[PDB]
Amino acid sequence: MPLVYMNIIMAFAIALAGLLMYRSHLMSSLLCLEGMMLSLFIMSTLIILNTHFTLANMMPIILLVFAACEAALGLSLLVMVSNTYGTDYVQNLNLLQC
Amino acid sequence: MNPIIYTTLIMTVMSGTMLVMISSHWLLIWIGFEMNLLAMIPVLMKNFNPRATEAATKYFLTQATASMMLMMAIIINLLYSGQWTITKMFNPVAMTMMTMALAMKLGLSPFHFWVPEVTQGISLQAGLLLLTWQKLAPLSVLCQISQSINPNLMLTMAMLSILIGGWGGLNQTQLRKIMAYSSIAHMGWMTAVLPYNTTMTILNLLIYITMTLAMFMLLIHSSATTTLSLSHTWNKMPVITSLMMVTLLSMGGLPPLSGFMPKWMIIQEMTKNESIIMPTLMAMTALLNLYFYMRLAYSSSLTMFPSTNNMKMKWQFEHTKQMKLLPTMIVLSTLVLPMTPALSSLN
Amino acid sequence: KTLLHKYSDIPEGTECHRKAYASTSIGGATGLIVSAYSIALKPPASFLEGVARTGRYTFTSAAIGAIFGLTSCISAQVREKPDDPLNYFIGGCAGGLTLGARTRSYGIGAAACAYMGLTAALVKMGQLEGWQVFAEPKV
Amino acid sequence: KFYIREPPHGSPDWLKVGLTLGTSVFLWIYLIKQHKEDVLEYKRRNGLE
Amino acid sequence: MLKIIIPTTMLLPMTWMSKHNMIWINATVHSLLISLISLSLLNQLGENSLNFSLTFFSDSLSAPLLVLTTWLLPLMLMASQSHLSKETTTRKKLYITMLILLQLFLIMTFTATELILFYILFEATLVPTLIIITRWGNQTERLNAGLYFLFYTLAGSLPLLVALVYIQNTTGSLNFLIIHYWSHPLSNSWSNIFMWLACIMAFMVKMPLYGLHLWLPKAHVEAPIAGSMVLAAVLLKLGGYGMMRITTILNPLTNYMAYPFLMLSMWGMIMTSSICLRQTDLKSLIAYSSVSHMALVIVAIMIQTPWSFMGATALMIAHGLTSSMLFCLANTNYERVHSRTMILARGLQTLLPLMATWWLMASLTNLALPPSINLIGELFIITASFSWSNITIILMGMNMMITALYSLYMLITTQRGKYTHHINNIKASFTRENALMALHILPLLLLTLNPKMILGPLY
Amino acid sequence: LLDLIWLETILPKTTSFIQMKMSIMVSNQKGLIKLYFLSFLITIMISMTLFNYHE
Amino acid sequence: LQYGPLAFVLGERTTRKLTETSKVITVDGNICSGKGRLAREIAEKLGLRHFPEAGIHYADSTTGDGKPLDVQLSGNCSLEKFYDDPKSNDGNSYRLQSWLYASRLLQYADALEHLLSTGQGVVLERSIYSDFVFLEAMYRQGFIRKQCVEHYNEVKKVTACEYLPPHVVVYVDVPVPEIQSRIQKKGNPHEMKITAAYLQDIENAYKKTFLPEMSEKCEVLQYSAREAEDAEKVVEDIEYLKCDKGPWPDQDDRTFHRLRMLVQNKLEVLNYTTIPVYLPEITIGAHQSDRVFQKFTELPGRKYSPGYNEDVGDKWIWLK
Amino acid sequence: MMSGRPGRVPLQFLPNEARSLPPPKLTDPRLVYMGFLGYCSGLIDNAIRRRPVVSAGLHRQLLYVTSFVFFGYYLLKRQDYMYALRDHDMFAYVKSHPEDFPEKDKKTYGEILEEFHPVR
Amino acid sequence: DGPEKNYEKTMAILQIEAEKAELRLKELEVRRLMRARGDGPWYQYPTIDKALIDHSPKTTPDN
Numbered sequence A: 001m002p003l004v005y006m007n008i009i010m011a012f013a014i015a016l017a018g019l020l021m022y023r024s025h026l027m028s029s030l031l032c033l034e035g036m037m038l039s040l041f042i043m044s045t046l047i048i049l050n051t052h053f054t055l056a057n058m059m060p061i062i063l064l065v066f067a068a069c070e071a072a073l074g075l076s077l078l079v080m081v082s083n084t085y086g087t088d089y090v091q092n093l094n095l096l097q098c
Numbered sequence B: 001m002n003p004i005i006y007t008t009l010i011m012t013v014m015s016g017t018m019l020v021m022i023s024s025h026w027l028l029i030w031i032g033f034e035m036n037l038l039a040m041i042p043v044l045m046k047n048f049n050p051r052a053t054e055a056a057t058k059y060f061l062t063q064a065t066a067s068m069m070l071m072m073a074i075i076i077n078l079l080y081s082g083q084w085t086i087t088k089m090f091n092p093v094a095m096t097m098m099t100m101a102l103a104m105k106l107g108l109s110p111f112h113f114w115v116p117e118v119t120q121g122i123s124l125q126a127g128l129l130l131l132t133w134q135k136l137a138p139l140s141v142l143c144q145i146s147q148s149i150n151p152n153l154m155l156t157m158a159m160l161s162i163l164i165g166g167w168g169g170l171n172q173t174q175l176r177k178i179m180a181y182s183s184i185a186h187m188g189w190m191t192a193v194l195p196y197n198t199t200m201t202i203l204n205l206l207i208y209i210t211m212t213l214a215m216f217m218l219l220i221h222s223s224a225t226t227t228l229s230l231s232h233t234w235n236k237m238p239v240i241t242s243l244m245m246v247t248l249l250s251m252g253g254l255p256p257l258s259g260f261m262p263k264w265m266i267i268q269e270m271t272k273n274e275s276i277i278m279p280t281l282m283a284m285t286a287l288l289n290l291y292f293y294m295r296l297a298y299s300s301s302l303t304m305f306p307s308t309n310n311m312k313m314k315w316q317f318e319h320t321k322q323m324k325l326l327p328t329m330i331v332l333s334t335l336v337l338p339m340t341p342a343l344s345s346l347n
Numbered sequence C: 001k002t003l004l005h006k007y008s009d010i011p012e013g014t015e016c017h018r019k020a021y022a023s024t025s026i027g028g029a030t031g032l033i034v035s036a037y038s039i040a041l042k043p044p045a046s047f048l049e050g051v052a053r054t055g056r057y058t059f060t061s062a063a064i065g066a067i068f069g070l071t072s073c074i075s076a077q078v079r080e081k082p083d084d085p086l087n088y089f090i091g092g093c094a095g096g097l098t099l100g101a102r103t104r105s106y107g108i109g110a111a112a113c114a115y116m117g118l119t120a121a122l123v124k125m126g127q128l129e130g131w132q133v134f135a136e137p138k139v
Numbered sequence D: 001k002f003y004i005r006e007p008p009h010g011s012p013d014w015l016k017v018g019l020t021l022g023t024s025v026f027l028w029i030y031l032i033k034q035h036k037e038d039v040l041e042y043k044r045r046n047g048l049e
Numbered sequence E: 001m002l003k004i005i006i007p008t009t010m011l012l013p014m015t016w017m018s019k020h021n022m023i024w025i026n027a028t029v030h031s032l033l034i035s036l037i038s039l040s041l042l043n044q045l046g047e048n049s050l051n052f053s054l055t056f057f058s059d060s061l062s063a064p065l066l067v068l069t070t071w072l073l074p075l076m077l078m079a080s081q082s083h084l085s086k087e088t089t090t091r092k093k094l095y096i097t098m099l100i101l102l103q104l105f106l107i108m109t110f111t112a113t114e115l116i117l118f119y120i121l122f123e124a125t126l127v128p129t130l131i132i133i134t135r136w137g138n139q140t141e142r143l144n145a146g147l148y149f150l151f152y153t154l155a156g157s158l159p160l161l162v163a164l165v166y167i168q169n170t171t172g173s174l175n176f177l178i179i180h181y182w183s184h185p186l187s188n189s190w191s192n193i194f195m196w197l198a199c200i201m202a203f204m205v206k207m208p209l210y211g212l213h214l215w216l217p218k219a220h221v222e223a224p225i226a227g228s229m230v231l232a233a234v235l236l237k238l239g240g241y242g243m244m245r246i247t248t249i250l251n252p253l254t255n256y257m258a259y260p261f262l263m264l265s266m267w268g269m270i271m272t273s274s275i276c277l278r279q280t281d282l283k284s285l286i287a288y289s290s291v292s293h294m295a296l297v298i299v300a301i302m303i304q305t306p307w308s309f310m311g312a313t314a315l316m317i318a319h320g321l322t323s324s325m326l327f328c329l330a331n332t333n334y335e336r337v338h339s340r341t342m343i344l345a346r347g348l349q350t351l352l353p354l355m356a357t358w359w360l361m362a363s364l365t366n367l368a369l370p371p372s373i374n375l376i377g378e379l380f381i382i383t384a385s386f387s388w389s390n391i392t393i394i395l396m397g398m399n400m401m402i403t404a405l406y407s408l409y410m411l412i413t414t415q416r417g418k419y420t421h422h423i424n425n426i427k428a429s430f431t432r433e434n435a436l437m438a439l440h441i442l443p444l445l446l447l448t449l450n451p452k453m454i455l456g457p458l459y
Numbered sequence F: 001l002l003d004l005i006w007l008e009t010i011l012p013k014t015t016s017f018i019q020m021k022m023s024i025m026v027s028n029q030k031g032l033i034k035l036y037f038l039s040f041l042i043t044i045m046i047s048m049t050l051f052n053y054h055e
Numbered sequence G: 001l002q003y004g005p006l007a008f009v010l011g012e013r014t015t016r017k018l019t020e021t022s023k024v025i026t027v028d029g030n031i032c033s034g035k036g037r038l039a040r041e042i043a044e045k046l047g048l049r050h051f052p053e054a055g056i057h058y059a060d061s062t063t064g065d066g067k068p069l070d071v072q073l074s075g076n077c078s079l080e081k082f083y084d085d086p087k088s089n090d091g092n093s094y095r096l097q098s099w100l101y102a103s104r105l106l107q108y109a110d111a112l113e114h115l116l117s118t119g120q121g122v123v124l125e126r127s128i129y130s131d132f133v134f135l136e137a138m139y140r141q142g143f144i145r146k147q148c149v150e151h152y153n154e155v156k157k158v159t160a161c162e163y164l165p166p167h168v169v170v171y172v173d174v175p176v177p178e179i180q181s182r183i184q185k186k187g188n189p190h191e192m193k194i195t196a197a198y199l200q201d202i203e204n205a206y207k208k209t210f211l212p213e214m215s216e217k218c219e220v221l222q223y224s225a226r227e228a229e230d231a232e233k234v235v236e237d238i239e240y241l242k243c244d245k246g247p248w249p250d251q252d253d254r255t256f257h258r259l260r261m262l263v264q265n266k267l268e269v270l271n272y273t274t275i276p277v278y279l280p281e282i283t284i285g286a287h288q289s290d291r292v293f294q295k296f297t298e299l300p301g302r303k304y305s306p307g308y309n310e311d312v313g314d315k316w317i318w319l320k
Numbered sequence H: 001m002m003s004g005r006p007g008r009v010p011l012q013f014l015p016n017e018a019r020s021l022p023p024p025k026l027t028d029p030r031l032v033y034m035g036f037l038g039y040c041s042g043l044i045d046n047a048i049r050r051r052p053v054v055s056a057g058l059h060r061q062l063l064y065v066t067s068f069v070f071f072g073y074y075l076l077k078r079q080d081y082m083y084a085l086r087d088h089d090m091f092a093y094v095k096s097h098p099e100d101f102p103e104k105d106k107k108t109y110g111e112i113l114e115e116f117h118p119v120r
Numbered sequence I: 001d002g003p004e005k006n007y008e009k010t011m012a013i014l015q016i017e018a019e020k021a022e023l024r025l026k027e028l029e030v031r032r033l034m035r036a037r038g039d040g041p042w043y044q045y046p047t048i049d050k051a052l053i054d055h056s057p058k059t060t061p062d063n
């Protein structure tokens, strides 16, 4: 388990940490969401290439197919929250507190 | 939303959940979750109220985070095992990552502050679909991987759910909010028995599905969303709220109503596993769930509440909608205790 | 969680300083958890008050841990009897009054004694008996 | 007659009700025949008679 | 026992599709017929309990309670006729359904074979009474009354469930016959104390016991009259029937941990009887009286002597007939005066001759004149307690003296004295409530002639 | 003093108040998403390592 | 088959029949301004159906034979208390307006069902966007306090946003001194008691809030009484109008599916007429509501859902 | 306790192997109770739909009871099959593993020292 | 009826419940050891099937 595995695993942790610390931006939040996807794609690519799991080389592709699909969903949701509330800071949508 | 697109949108949700319960490959299980999330977000914001947008939004970030963590926990399992099959997880960190990864989809432990107001903002129709159908998929994954589960973590997940769910419901008026905390309370009950006997949580799931279904489409018929709005239904529809008493009592587990069958049968199983202190605990803290059930029962028809003069022509008109299996759902949700040994059909 | 087993590593009664320190650490550690949540979901206003809130909860929990530490070892020493539910019971207003004194009030403090009184008695019961909480699946 | 507009269930739907008895007898004689053949399947599986 | 179960559940369709005015006549007549059929259950062998079926069995303890329930059911039917006239027919049938459902659960509870089946219908009685107490009550507080009555019983019920299912995994069965026949000594291990405890507070919370009784004054004084009798007459005794059952296995633990409840009770009735003497509401006295009378029963069961068990059974049945009478008696006065204040309507003998009698021996049975079964149960407790400890005598002897003190006090403060001249609505006493008291009292003297049928299986 | 002042204060009202008092702090959530997911992060972190549920 | 989502899936559309002939119109005239004559005159010649002004008992016509039910069971209020003594603590005045509000909800609702299931336009006498005119005139004349008034708009906004304004309307203009003479000329004894300032308050609200805010939702056709008695020019201009400005063209079939779905079932149409707001003129006593709800039950037909009441016929119940 | 036992064909309600078991009797109280559930469901249907409860449309009512008994019947046949399987692996495993379930001799009451706790 | 009613009825009832009692205790331990050892008809958790493996000659000789 060489150091490149450490780099991208520790990377995904900061993607997890980055997502879980929304400061003032939904768009920057979605950035960290797609950020997670890099490390998962990159680690998955390293795994099935190292192990010569040739039939499983499709798995990183199918990750990406369902990757941007969420990415489109996030921005489409971001379209209306910014459209009808003006901005994208995740603090002005607290009307559901009650 | 046009009717035809709505149907295909629903079918995608059912297909997404069905993909989870039939696939043997971890990637496909993740895909089934992804399709389930993708087809559901439009369903929540069907009416396009301002509330539904962030209600659907809070759904998205929570479950996307859960899906991404689930994908990561899958990847480590592949790294240390080279397997995609749903048998068990050969890295303890991989398992200890999926429990919360699946928990936020279920909404059990403090990964639950999304459940109340996502139920509140969205309509009653999708609220029913959210709290009943969206739990078969994550629970099905848990049932398959039930072998390699850290009992200390999984039990704490459920114990926290019962305490918070019961405690939170005591301070809710909006009927959807109380249902969410009540659902969270039942979340712990099903998941507490998960490590010991997976047949039991299936039984509790089936009973809870009937409880939440029958309760909700009674709320749909009553066309009420807050406790005060429900109160007036005694003036118009006395039988609906009178039936709502028995379902509320059953939902609280007050026997011999059908709602006792999970709470009873579960307790019997864990005492077989020398677990005694914890079963006594949820027996105690199921009572706070019962509290706001009776308060709902008191406010609905156990005590007739002040009405509104605008109800005359309301009595002049009957419902045109046609809830089906409602007469059936009440029967299973109230009186199936004599057929308790039927749990062996699941086994 | 190794620090939790450190309580069982040192036998009761003896190492009264160590037992008090162990429970003080157990209380202080648990104090960090609740403060970390409370500082999170309950909104702060500044860094100064955030640690001030952290200090308050850590102070109570560490103090609650400590006194239960002393009361346990001294009771097992004055009576020279380790196995005693009362040994943990006298931690009742030991914890209750101090927690009701950290936020000085007779209502919370006096009403507290019993609640962790039998709880401390009950955890001692499982210490002596074979009671398990998170029992693994036997059947 | 009282309701001037044709009530939504003013008259029976002879298609709907006629189906209802039509299927119900099916539900019975299936169960009746199934109960018998299960009994015949009994007495020779274990050689009861 | 389905010869009683089947007709009892058959009362539901008959009462639910009868005519808008025949519901009272039909329900009363056939419930009485069920009582006559239930009278055949008085037959008991030497010691073999009547084992009708696998899931149903009865002995000399279950049947007297069984007849008490069945005989009682027409009594609330006639009592409720007064204040249920101003109601719609559908809701009236709903009221009858709750009473019949309450009866049906009671018969299954007493005739249950194993403890878990007994537990299911035992607790199941909470639901019919919860609707009765809350829906058909009279005052704002009834909402707080239902929660107090529900949670109190449930708070103790759940620990018993955990202990009961634990019995099945350890002993192998929960059937009462096997448990008593396969009875084994219970060790004094620290777990076994809680094992003993979890099977106790469920029965004593609804007894009620001193301290854990506050639901009793908060429900009986506040429930509708029909629910008031069944609560006091039988529902409290559900703990008694269970405790004679559960004590067959919980030995020899009872020697030690009876103490914290014994003098909790022993100081209890004397304390409670003192509260009865100084009440302000009528129904509050009888409710506080009921726990006082129930308190000696707690000592009777716990002391574990054959004489006390016979005394427990006799006092159990005698108190049910009594407490039902006084609660009915208070209802009669409350209806005309629209309140329950004691000194509100003192001095009514001059206007209520037959009532003044119905006060007279009902209180005397509360004083327990000899040879009423109240003393036969009470005196047997005394002899058993004295054999246990001589110093016992002063306490409950003083209690039955302060019991005597109040038990004439409402007689003085309701019948003795001068009428209130502003009151002018005390009409001629209707035969309905009048005959209701007759059906209450005559079985008491009839059972006084042959008490040998109500001392339980230990006779 | 004994019955109507202490008994209902020694068991029913205390437990009812305890649920009453802290049901508020559970349910008085302002709804900030940043605060919700921050609690997720702490729960995620203390799940392992600190509580060592992975060990 | 009733129009549900199944029909739309089958292809049942209403935009195909929604044409220039589907004009839902109503003559919003003053009190005794001849608006009913003008409305019916439009009806005969334009081919449109006539909806008489939905009164307190129009809902009784929507449910069953149509005989006006008892006042206590069909509104709890009546019109004579309005006109004779329009000041009392019982608040019959607003109970009229609150009840009369829901009547025009149905009157417009049945107007929809006519021209979305057939495409044939209708004629009414005033409509939902006329009830506030009376209520605004109610407050200025000292009838019922503003707490009812401020609740009125809250209820009005949540029972009309889903509702689409009509195609056109007609405002008949009759001078207010003449109207006071007209009401005095008819001889209805309740018409004598009417304050003269009430009529001009109706005229003011007609040309202060209704006509201005209506202009961008339907065409202004303000016609004087001298322009009202002639029944032709009031309808040639309707044909010579454009029906361009307004939200009607931009309502595709999916809006019409949403529209007819909500208006097919009245229960959610007036679900927000019974807001849990307790008011002196609206909050019936628990006992009073209970008996009154019972009182509604002994009435024939009003025991089971329509088509099941054996008391008024409905044979073959054991199969229905 | 059974989804992992060998030979368990998935998604197969009643195995052909299960036909060797006694079919549930038609009078079976478990079965007739499920018929009552259909009867009760019919009455609930007319209550919400505002219909003459008991005397309302029998075809809607009679369908409910007829449906419930049927799905009740196969559920009861599956009931005993699984219980029989529980009792089949019961004794085969007991015979296969005899040493962990030893036979207990007889040590009759006349010889046990069991004491009598004085109940005084 | 005579005491032979209740006497023989109890004999049947007591015996039948006795067999159930012992069987219940036997089931508890049988499941307990079957779950632990796993060498039993049930509790066999699924594993990878061996028919999926391909045995045909691959590209490299040494595998």
Ligand SMILES: Nc1nc2c(ncn2[C@@H]2O[C@H](COP(=O)(O)OP(=O)(O)OP(=O)(O)O)[C@@H](O)[C@H]2O)c(=O)[nH]1
Pocket: G029, G030, G031, G032, G033, G034, G035, G036, G037, G053, G054, G055, G079, G096, G097, G100, G101, G104, G126, G130, G131, G134
């Ligand atoms: N409160 C209230 N009263 C209404 C409403 N609609 C109609 N009315 C009353 O209906 C009654 C009759 O209306 P008018 O316009 O005078 O009827 P008309 O005499 O036929 O009128 P013309 O056709 O112009 O002659 C009046 O008392 C109106 O105030 C409504 O929505 N609310």
